[PDB]
Amino acid sequence: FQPTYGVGYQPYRVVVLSFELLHAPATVCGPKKSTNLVKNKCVNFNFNG
C-alpha cells in the first residue's frame, strides 16, 4: 500500500461485528434504563430486547 495509489488500491480498515443474537442469556446490551418489575397486571414488557 502507497499513499499515491488510486482509491480501489488504497487500504481500508474493516471491522465486522458478528452478533450471537440467540435465545441464549445476554452479556452485551444497548444502554436501556431498566424499570422496576410489575406483576399480576396486563403490561408491556421488554426482556433483553
Binding site: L22, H23, A24, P25
Partner: peptide, 24 residues
C-alpha cells in the same frame, strides 16, 4: 473392538425451555 450405542448421544438442540411437548 465395537459395541452398540442403544439410545445414547441425544442433546438439547437449542437454549429454549419447552415442556409437555413432542418436538421434531
Amino acid at each position: 473392538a465395537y459395541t452398540n450405542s442403544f439410545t445414547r448421544g441425544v442433546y438439547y438442540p437449542d437454549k429454549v425451555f419447552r415442556s409437555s411437548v413432542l418436538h421434531s
